[model samples]
Target: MLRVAVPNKGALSEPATEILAEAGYRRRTDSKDLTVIDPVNNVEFFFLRPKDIAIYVGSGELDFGITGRDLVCDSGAQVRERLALGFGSSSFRYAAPAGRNWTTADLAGMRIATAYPNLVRKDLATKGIEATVIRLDGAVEISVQLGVADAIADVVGSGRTLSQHDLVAFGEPLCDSEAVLIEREARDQLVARVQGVVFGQQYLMLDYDCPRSALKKATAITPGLSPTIAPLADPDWVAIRALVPRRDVNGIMDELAAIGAKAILASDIRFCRF
Candidate 1:
């Protein structure tokens, strides 16, 4: 049986659980259930805190897991990313009160508040800057106003929270993070299964018909991975079916239309092997 760890709560929890359920794994019947057994697939799911996920995986207590990329780095665990789940996207950045331009160099001797202390310390050390790091579990942004910190390093999603606190992010992001699948070591079948679901979520299957003469140009516009081409009832036309990225589907359709492709269609792929 395969053992896996999942985020019990947080921004990453719902999407992570959704992806697993979409991948044909059983989900916990109760939100508070710490463990779930999927007998049919021979897999066991252990719900844990996102911050501690990589630690458990790296310690070999779990075979695989899903977590934020930033959390994995902060844990200093020996886990390898098996797949990028492409959700819970955020940037870890330094923020200070708005108005003055603040750089990492200016952080010298300043108190920097953050939930991710290790990541911030590593970045400061790399730049040869010295600062006092204040550790906070949550509400790092409020630290500056409360006089507990001069600046903060924390996750920036829409930058709305920073604006709400009259803070502005400065300096390059310490880490660009998103939900990701991780494992202590390479495990082929499990990785592939999860990857297949991730890919399914990211892409759509497109079906279109085109004049044989325009086939070349149309395929060039939406050349999906191993696209399938078949002859239409009319010998002068051909039907094309291929997988296209969901994000690019509309743009690709526009390009195909300009190229005279007709009967264009796009559909979802719930699951796939490749």
Candidate 2:
């Protein structure tokens, strides 16, 4: 059985489990359960802390896992990313009080606070800037007001948290992060299964009918992975089926209508292999 590690708590846990369930894996019946065995799929899931996921996968204690890109870099583990899961997106950046302009260079000789101290230190070193990095567990943003640090290097999501604290992010992001599928090494079949589900979330199936004369223009609008085209009973019309990105579905429908297509329909794809 392939052993996999998943986040047990924090921002990544819920969505991570949901994706696995969508992929036909057995979910833990109890919230407190640490492991779930799916005998049918021949896979065992071990739930661990999001931050520690990379360490377990990198040590080969697990075959694959899900974690944030920033956490992986902070752990400094030797693991390869199998797929970008497309959630838990955030940025690691430097932030200070809002009134004054700030740059990464302004951090020189200053005390910086963050949960991922190593990541901050590396960025400072890369820029040849010297600063004291104070490590904090969760509330790095408040460190400045508390006088423990001059600024903070922390995760920025909607920037609301920083705004509430009167802080503004500056400089290029240290890391652009999102939930990702990771492994000790490249595993083709395992990666493919998870990637398929991720793609399913991004795309939807579109079905429409177009007159034979307008078929050319309609196909040009959707042309999804060589869409399925077939003759209808009327003979003057053809049925078209194709996968369309969920984000573009509405615009595509409008374009199809303008091009003389009919019965344009969009449906969700729960799961897909390709």
Candidate 3:
């Protein structure tokens, strides 16, 4: 039985749990429960803080874990990312007072504040900038205005927070990050099961009916190779079912509509063999 460490709360938790449930893992049974049991697969899950997920995985204390790439890099944990899980996407950036003169060279010997010290250090070193890093576990953005540091290195999602703080992103992005699956070492059995679950959550089944004569035109814009086309009870019609990524559904619907396809519906992918 593989033990998987999952984020218990905050931004990454809900989506992480939803993806696991879609992959046939035990769904959240109760709001207060920290451990979830998957009886069918004899798998066990431990919910922990996102920041600590990589520590457990890299120490080989857990079979695998899910957390944001920024947290993993920040912790400086040695682990292999088996798959990019595609949620909690954000970028690490350096923000300074809006309209203020700021550049990479300006960081030399200056105080920089961040929650992610390791990543900040690595990024600064790669740019050949010398800066004294001040580690703060929370509210790093406000530290700058409070005079704790000259600037802040932090996660930038919508930039709304920065705007509210009168800050602007003035330096190169440190890293583009998203949620990922990590492991200490490859365990064939564990890896196979996790990969199967990940692939299972990557897509949805789109089913629609279109007139048989319009099949050619519909397939042309279907987003992938030929959809599964089969004759409907009405000989003049056909049923088309294809897999599409969650992100592409909106555009796909519009394109199929223009191609004369009707009765479009998308169903959740429960589990996948590959």
Candidate 4:
């Protein structure tokens, strides 16, 4: 049986639970149920902290897990990112007060507060900047205002935390973070299944009827993996179904209409697999 690790709660948890369910796997119905056995899939799932996922995966005791890119990089674990899940995007950066126009270069001798000290220290070393890093479990944002540190390097998404504290963030972000499916040793089937649901979420399914003569041009317009076609009894027309990217759906529909297609229907896909 394959073993997997999932985030136990909030932020990363909701999306992981959703995608796994979308991939046709059983999940914990009870919030307290940290472990779930999916016999049908022949897999066992263990829920854990988002921060500890790589440590578990790196041990090679677990086959795969879902965690943040930042978490993996900071952990320095012997694991590789299998796929990026496209959610929980964030940036780990060097932030200081808006009161000063500071640059990444000026961070040379400043004391930094961060939860991810290792990642912060590494970025400093790469630039040969020797700064003291104060490790804080949380609330790294408040450290600078309270004057315990000169500046801070922490996760900032939207920079609201910086704004509220009258701070400004500079430098190319140290880490562009995203929730990722990570692997040590893994199964292609589960990964492939997850990919289907992820790809399906990115697109909408479009169904339409077109004149057989218009097939060439209309198919070119929707160009999905390959549009499925069926006879409509009236040989002059055919029914077609295809996946069109969510962002391009409206325009694709408009083009289909102009090209003599009719009764077009667009709907959300829970998942799509070959």
Please provide TM-scores, in order, for all candidate models, with all chains considered together.
0.86, 0.82, 0.76, 0.79
lDDT, candidate 2, equals: 0.88
Per-residue accuracy of model 4 over 127-239 as CA lDDT, tens digit each: 98898899998888899978899898888887887889877888888987888999872398989898888887788889999999999998899788667999899999999
Q: Could you tally the backbone clashes for each prediction?
A: 0, 0, 0, 0
Task: State the lDDT of candidate 3 residue by residue for 158-268, as single tens digits.
Answer: 989989988888766787678888887325655565556665566778899988888888776564424688899999899988877777788888888887789899887
Runs in model 2 deviating more than 4 A are 185-187, 206-242, 248-265
lDDT of 2 at 7: 93
Global CA lDDT computed for model 4: 0.88
User: How would the candidate models be sorted by TM-score, starting from the highest?
Assistant: 1, 2, 4, 3
Residue 190 displacement in candidate 2 (angstroms): 2.8
Best by TM-score: 1
lDDT of each: 0.89, 0.88, 0.81, 0.88
lDDT of 1 at 184: 91
Error of 3 at 80 (Å): 1.0
Which wins on TM-score, candidate 2 or candidate 3? Answer: 2
Judge candidate 2 at residue 170 and give its lDDT: 93
Q: Residue 215 lDDT in model 1?
A: 85
* lDDT per residue as tens, model 1, 91-136: 8899999979888888999999999899888889999999999899
